[PDB]
Design a binder for this molecule. Sequence first.
Ligand SMILES: CCCCNc1ccc(C(=O)OCCN(C)C)cc1
Lengths: 149, 156
Amino acid sequence: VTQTMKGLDIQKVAGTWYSLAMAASDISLLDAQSAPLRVYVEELKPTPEGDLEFLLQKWENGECAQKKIIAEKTKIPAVFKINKVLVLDTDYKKYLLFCMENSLACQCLVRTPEVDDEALEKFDKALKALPMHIRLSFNPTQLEEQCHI
Amino acid sequence: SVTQTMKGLDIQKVAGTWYSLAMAASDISLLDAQSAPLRVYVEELKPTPEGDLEFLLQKWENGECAQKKIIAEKTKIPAVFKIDALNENKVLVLDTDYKKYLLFCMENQSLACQCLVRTPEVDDEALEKFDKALKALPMHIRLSFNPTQLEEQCHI
Ligand SMILES: CCCCNc1ccc(C(=O)OCCN(C)C)cc1
């Protein structure tokens, strides 16, 4: 992943998000509820030091676990270290596109638990240069359920 | 569910070798596991003397790769077939050029579609036409397979 967001203002990504769609380089990264990169972003909280706190849900040992993880800033405003987190694009008010790279998985986040045509079209365009072998998308009912069940 | 069928399908010309390059389904659970209900790999098509279409496929069953044969019976629409199985179903051929790619769906309402290729290689045209076809359909999971997997039992 090289195409990261120019001019990111991380403070404007604060608040609630919903994982609408995800894609990964390897089927095993996303295929099961327990798959390693099957994670649902529920909130982003930029820190006073310019780090990025993720609140996510992840299926572990038969429960939907909530995790709070700090992604530490790097010299590239759009790149953090949790894996590298790369923010490809956001309009702050509607969508955010990011990837996790070690293996590669990318997500389309939306501000409201609804399908957004613009967000998904931009996600598809961003994935054209990336060697993805699994793509998932979630319905509005799933977005509001613990671990998108 | 599926609006697009192949006009003027000649089932004799779809006969022979195929490989499942990509698949997509309306419900993640139809395709997410090696054991998922619509996770099947088409290896060969055989038209019958009655104009039915026999699918020779691989399916993960009892933790091993099994060979299975499924007859999709002809209907009054050339590109639409029906498997004698408990559940109401349709097999729909969306598009083929016969010599490189074939796009089909299974409707059960559950829906899964596949991109078949003649040669066990990633084909840009096959995948681009598959993706265009899927824009019309409410898919929540898409898988694609590397050329090594195409020639392994059950795409392992
Ligand atoms: C650049 C403007 C940043 C303003 N911040 C926000 C603006 C909007 C939202 C938000 O969630 O809006 C959803 C409603 N649709 C119409 C936008 C969340 C944060």
